[PDB]
Design a protein around this ligand. Structure first.
Ligand SMILES: [K+]
Ligand SMILES: [K+]
Ligand SMILES: [K+]
Ligand SMILES: [K+]
Ligand SMILES: [K+]
Ligand SMILES: [Mg+2]
Ligand SMILES: [Mg+2]
Ligand SMILES: [Mg+2]
Ligand SMILES: [Mg+2]
Ligand SMILES: [Mg+2]
Ligand SMILES: [Mg+2]
Ligand SMILES: [Mg+2]
Ligand SMILES: [Mg+2]
Ligand SMILES: [Mg+2]
Ligand SMILES: [Mg+2]
Ligand SMILES: [Mg+2]
Ligand SMILES: [Mg+2]
Ligand SMILES: [Mg+2]
Ligand SMILES: [Mg+2]
Ligand SMILES: [Mg+2]
Ligand SMILES: [Mg+2]
Ligand SMILES: [Mg+2]
Ligand SMILES: [Mg+2]
Ligand SMILES: [Mg+2]
Ligand SMILES: [Mg+2]
Ligand SMILES: [Mg+2]
Lengths: 26, 97, 152, 205, 41, 124, 181, 46
RNA sequence: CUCCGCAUAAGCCUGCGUCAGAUUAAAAUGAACUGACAAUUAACAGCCCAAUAUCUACAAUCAACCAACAAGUCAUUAUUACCCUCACUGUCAACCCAACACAGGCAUGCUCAUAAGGAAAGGUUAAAAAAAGUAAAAGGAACUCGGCAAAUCUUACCCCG
RNA sequence: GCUACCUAAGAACAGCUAAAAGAGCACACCCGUCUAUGUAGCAAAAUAGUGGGAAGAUUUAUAGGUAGAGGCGACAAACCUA
RNA sequence: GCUAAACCUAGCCCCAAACCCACUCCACCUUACUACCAGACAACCUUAGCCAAACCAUUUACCCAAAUAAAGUAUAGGCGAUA
């Protein structure tokens, strides 16, 4: 495990965008 | 791969604990204390590093003459080898002469 | 005795005697066919056939005609999850033959009739399981998987 | 005997059981659970003792303590904080559903005063005879250690001596007379053995 | 103090997004795509 | 290709090795000329087994018994129980001297005894 | 006879066999040596019947009826051996004053480490023994460096052990901060 | 010819060449056992 | 088919015995892998000896003729001391050294062709090239650096040693 | 524990010819002449056939000895754990 | 959709402080871990070289009992390298 918070937070945002594309909301 | 999938636990820091609230106190013990004490005497750590600064070769040379008679045999042998390697690098290798 | 120092003997010295012996022997069932008079034991390594005779005659009042011993190797083949060999302890086997024509047959120490309990046993948890298991019935094929609980 | 790895995780099932072996094989290595250190003397919760649940699915309920696990500071109470699990299942039969209790930390329970059925805090003290006991802070009253059946299962009040069980009158009879002789010498005089030969001296080195 | 690159994933994705429409292994393997993305620009 | 991390035993080695190594059994004699073994009756441990007839004690003890505390026996505890009473009586009688210590039970030496205490020459 | 190696015929096949408690060391300090020498053989015969049953249960691939019986007898056999040895040790201190029944001495081995040498019984004095004089009880000066290296190895271990314990305690307050007191 | 079979086991030769008694026979063999004791070898000698 | 086989020594150390198996061999009966249980029993062999002095020219080879050199593996007496006796250990296997369940390496006795021990073909088709063999018209070294190889069963000479 | 040489005490060598043999034919056994095959193979030097020797300066099991500024060597600058 | 991916503990490092240092029984220098028999063998002795000198041949720093400073000074040295 690498220490840091900026990259993990930035990676969660890309996952959300990916999730929205796969399952777009009404 | 190579990046965590979850966020790490929050990094909670107490900016007003004893060590942070009282940092820097008694740094002017000499100016305001009639120079009875010197700020370097407030430094704690290795006895060969208190109030002193040098490069690795200077640090290694200083440690060997101050605590070298108390060092473990394996650690002392490695110290002597480190001093030999550093002596050659600093005095024989480099870009400038 | 084992794990003890033996007093050294010299010509004309006292007889060697052990008042409390820590030798512990276990009678075992033979794996292969043996004569009727023959009996089989598992004894410690330090024990001798001469001791087993005097040990049996004195403690158990059993006359023995002959005693034979062999050392059985324990496999050191088994390995653990760290690939380190596990040793099965080596043990000594003794074959004893009775003296006056007596015959010994290993008894059945686990009779099925005795093992079966005539007296009723009513474990609460087991009764709960058995009752419920019996009452519930398999799904009727004609029902087609429709929940049966509903009376409607 | 006992074979516990360095960081063995204690659980509801006892060590050495078939369930614990499957759960905790020799090879696994898990993060050690952190347990607040509590002196054996300070521990105040014992089996058979009523306790009130402060936090959980069913708070404010009082129940008897059936089991305690000191290694993890756990308290198990019957019929409270219980989930449901199918027991005795098979491939064809779904199984029987039963309520299974979940362990509670010593901070999620609170002892109750016998006089008033309310949660209270207790501090150890000593009586006149000197026997140590636990006393409630508010409305201080004695709270004796609830009697609990022994682990082995033997009930002294219902014991029947068998054919290989020595009697109380024969196991407490005193027959020893302090003397200056060893078992060897004292037994040879009773058995009747006589040995006139002497033991020649040896060298020790 | 030991420092390690924690965001190397984003550094290579800004190169591979320009190689998605390429053919072969130079559309997903950084080593190969970087040399063809640089030629495209 | 040898197993140097395995217990060395009489089962390993050539014929001369396997006959010279044992398993821990004490000897009961010596070898004479002709490889003839001579057994010594005094070297064989004799089992001193008592008569167990009419013996009250049994392998187990009933649970209906008190939980008496443990008081390990000490040398001082054994002196006061057995030796002290005889000394007190003679002290009151007025006839006590160190020379008679052997009469009280004291042993000046261990030689000339069948069961010596140090170095002990008997089995458990 | 050979009927004492097995349990009462009626008990064969039963899953439980009631048994009493194990002899305690204090209950045996009241019995005489002659009574303890008789009891040793009563427990010995009960131990052999339990070892014979334990082995036949494995042969038949079944569980032993009451395994605790064997544990109780073993505890009684050890307690009885503790009492007798206690009386002999106390009797040796009074007549001789020695704390050990077997002679010995503190000596340095060929490797330079302290060891307690237990003496053996011999027929000839030590200056005539061929095999005893080949053994060395003294270390030469080429051992001093290894003794220090082995001492420094133990110090490193003991230092990691002490620093680790301090760490656990410092990490044990982060989650339970009410332990400051 | 074909090589690789140089090891022809003999327990006598093995105990006489690298055995415990021969190690202690010389001061250099005692230092061998001391180095293996320092490193933590499970086997000090044959 | 029989390249052997049985046994001993050496080495190895439970390594195809029973039960069970989700493991395994090309093979979801077998098993050398896993778990449990069992097993090799001394008469063979190993493990020996009281002291001091003293004795010991004449091989072996069917050892008799005979003939040798390289000149050989076997022996006691005197005096003293010495009435208890069958312990301990090895004993299994399809096995060792070669990283392998390797066409290699491995002492001795018996068997000298077996009374023992084994199976070259997973099935099909029957192209090339390649490998190992058999037969071959007429000719018979014209091949080739060379009669290599194969077949056959042969003369003479030279150099070097 | 391979190999080179040595020490101690052992073992093996059919049959035929000549009967004298560091003699010949020729098994076991030792070696490895030529050819093909094999070349990450059965094999980190092998297989098949053909060959040299086979009562001697022979082959061989066991234990021991010589150790790197060295040893050993019927000198191939051989061999001393591929 | 598979194969996989992801984690936070185990403990470790550098200092400070403090000198350090065993045990149930039994076995263990002979073939260690081997109950039991006539012995007399005994320990000490300059490190060298790589390297640097652009080869090399004299020479070439290696804790040695107080941090600092005196001082890279006196001095040594194919009076070169360097010490
Ligand atoms: K430089
Ligand atoms: K094996
Ligand atoms: K091969
Ligand atoms: K056959
Ligand atoms: K140069
Ligand atoms: Mg035998
Ligand atoms: Mg014999
Ligand atoms: Mg056999
Ligand atoms: Mg086939
Ligand atoms: Mg085919
Ligand atoms: Mg073709
Ligand atoms: Mg033709
Ligand atoms: Mg031509
Ligand atoms: Mg021609
Ligand atoms: Mg032509
Ligand atoms: Mg030809
Ligand atoms: Mg010639
Ligand atoms: Mg060889
Ligand atoms: Mg010779
Ligand atoms: Mg011949
Ligand atoms: Mg010839
Ligand atoms: Mg010839
Ligand atoms: Mg030669
Ligand atoms: Mg030449
Ligand atoms: Mg040349
Ligand atoms: Mg130079």
């Amino acid at each position: 495990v690498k220490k840091g918070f900026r990259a993990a937070f930035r990676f969660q945002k890309e996952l959300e965008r990916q999730r929205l594309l796969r399952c777009p909301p009404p | 791969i190579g990046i965590r999938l979850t966020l790490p636990p929050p990094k909670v820091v107490d900016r007003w604990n004893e060590k942070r609230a009282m940092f820097g106190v008694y740094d002017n013990i000499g100016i305001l204390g009639n120079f009875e004490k010197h700020p370097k005497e407030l430094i704690r750590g290795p006895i060969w590093l208190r109030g002193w600064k040098g490069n690795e070769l200077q640090r290694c040379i200083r440690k060997r003459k101050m605590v070298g008679s108390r060092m473990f045999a394996d650690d002392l042998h490695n110290l002597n080898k480190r001093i030999r390697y550093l002596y050659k690098h600093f005095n024989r290798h480099g870009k400038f002469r | 005795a084992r794990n003890v120092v033996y007093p050294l003997y010299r010509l004309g010295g006292p007889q060697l005697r052990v008042f409390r012996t820590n030798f512990f022997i276990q009678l075992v069932r033979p794996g292969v066919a043996q004569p009727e008079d023959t009996v089989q034991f598992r004894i410690p390594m330090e024990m001798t056939r001469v001791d087993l005779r005097n040990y049996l005659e004195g403690i158990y009042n059993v006359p023995v005609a002959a005693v034979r011993t062999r050392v059985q190797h324990g496999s050191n083949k088994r390995r653990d999850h760290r690939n380190v060999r596990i040793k099965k302890p080596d043990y000594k086997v003794a074959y004893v033959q009775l003296a006056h024509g007596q015959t010994f047959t290993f008894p059945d120490l686990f009779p099925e009739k005795d093992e079966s309990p005539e007296g009723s046993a009513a474990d609460d948890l087991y009764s709960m399981l058995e009752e419920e298991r019996q009452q519930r019935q398999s799904s009727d094929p004609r029902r087609g998987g429709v929940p049966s609980w509903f009376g409607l | 005997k006992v074979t516990l790895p360095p960081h063995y995780r204690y659980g509801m099932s006892p060590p050495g059981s078939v369930a614990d072996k499957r759960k905790n094989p020799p090879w696994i290595r898990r993060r050690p659970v952190v347990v607040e250190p509590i002196s054996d003397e300070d521990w105040y919760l014992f089996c058979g003792d009523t306790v009130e649940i402060l936090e959980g699915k069913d708070a404010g309920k009082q129940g008897k303590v059936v089991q305690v696990i000191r290694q993890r500071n756990w308290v198990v109470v019957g019929g409270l904080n219980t989930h449901y699990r199918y027991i005795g299942k098979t491939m064809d039969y779904r199984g029987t559903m039963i309520p299974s209790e979940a362990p509670l930390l010593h901070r999620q329970v609170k002892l109750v005063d016998p006089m008033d059925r309310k949660p209270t805090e207790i501090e150890w003290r000593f009586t006149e005879a000197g026997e140590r006991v636990r006393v409630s802070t508010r409305s201080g009253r004695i709270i004796p250690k609830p009697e609990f059946p022994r682990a082995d299962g033997i009930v002294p009040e219902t014991w029947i001596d068998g054919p290989k069980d020595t009697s109380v009158e024969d196991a407490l009879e005193r027959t020893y007379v302090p003397c200056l002789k060893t078992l060897q010498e004292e037994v040879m005089e009773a058995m009747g053995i006589k040995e006139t030969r002497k033991y020649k001296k040896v060298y020790w080195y | 103090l030991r420092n390690r690159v924690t965001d190397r994933y984003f550094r290579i994705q800004e190169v591979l997004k320009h190689a998605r429409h390429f053919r072969g292994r130079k559309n997903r393997c950084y080593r190969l795509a970087v040399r063809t993305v640089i030629r495209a620009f | 290709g040898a197993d140097r991390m395995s217990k060395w035993t009489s089962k390993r080695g050539p014929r001369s090795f396997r006959g010279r190594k044992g398993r821990g059994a004490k000897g009961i004699g010596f070898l004479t000329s002709g490889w003839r073994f001579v057994q010594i009756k005094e070297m064989v441990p004799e089992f001193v087994v008592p008569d167990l007839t009419g013996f009250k004690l049994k392998p187990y003890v009933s649970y209906l018994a008190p939980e008496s505390e443990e008081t390990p026996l000490t040398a001082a505890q054994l002196f006061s129980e057995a030796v002290a009473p005889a000394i007190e009586k003679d002290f009151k009688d007025g006839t006590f001297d160190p020379d008679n210590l052997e009469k009280y039970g004291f042993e000046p030496t261990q030689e000339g005894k069948l069961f010596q205490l140090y170095p002990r020459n008997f089995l458990r | 006879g050979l009927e004492e190696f097995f349990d009462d015929p009626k008990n064969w096949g039963q899953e439980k066999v009631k048994s009493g408690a194990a002899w305690t060391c204090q209950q045996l300090r009241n019995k005489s040596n002659e009574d303890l020498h008789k009891l040793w053989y009563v427990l010995l015969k009960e131990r052999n019947m339990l070892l014979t049953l334990e082995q036949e249960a494995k042969r038949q691939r079944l569980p032993m009826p009451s395994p605790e019986r064997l544990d109780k007898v073993v505890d009684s056999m050890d307690a009885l051996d503790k009492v007798v040895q206690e009386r002999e040790d106390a009797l040796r201190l009074l007549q001789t004053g020695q704390e050990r029944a077997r002679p010995g001495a503190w000596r340095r081995d060929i490797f330079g480490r302290i060891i307690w040498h237990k003496f053996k019984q011999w027929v000839i004095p030590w200056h005539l023994n061929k095999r005893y004089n080949r053994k060395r009880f003294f270390a030469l000066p080429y051992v001093d460096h290894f003794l220090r290296l082995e001492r420094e190895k133990r110090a490193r271990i003991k230092a990691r052990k002490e620093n680790l314990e301090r760490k656990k305690a410092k990490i044990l307050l982060k989650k339970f901060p009410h332990l400051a007191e | 010819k074909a090589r690789g079979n140089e090891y022809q086991p003999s327990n006598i030769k093995r105990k006489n060449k690298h055995g415990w008694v021969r190690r202690l026979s010389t001061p250099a063999g005692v230092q061998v056992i001391l180095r293996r004791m320092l490193k933590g070898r499970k086997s000090l000698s044959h």
